[PDB]
């Protein structure tokens, strides 16, 4: 839309918030930050990682093929 006067039509929705001075800025940061991060990692790792694994394999293979191509052949 354009401005906060009219963006959408919402009926029967209640929301609750507290002051920033009455809540902790890091509420149980590690104890619930670790499992959420591993949950997101388990959701995305099978889509993200194997292309970059293929890139690493292709990079290593092409490099070692280049140094084997630079060497000489014993036939002469």
């Amino acid at each position: 839309g354009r401005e906060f006067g009219n963006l959408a039509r919402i009926r029967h929705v209640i929301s609750y918030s507290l002051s920033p001075f009455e809540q902790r800025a890091f509420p149980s940061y590690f104890s619930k930050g670790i499992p959420n991060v591993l949950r997101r990692t388990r959701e995305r790792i099978l889509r993200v990682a194997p292309p970059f694994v293929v890139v690493y394999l292709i990079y290593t293979w092409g490099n070692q093929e280049f140094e084997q191509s630079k060497r000489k052949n014993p036939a002469m």
């Binding site: 919402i10 009926r11 929705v13």
Partner: peptide
């Protein structure tokens, strides 16, 4: 209303 609450 159900759809836009679910989206929110």
């Amino acid at each position: 209303n159900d759809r836009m609450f679910r989206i929110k």
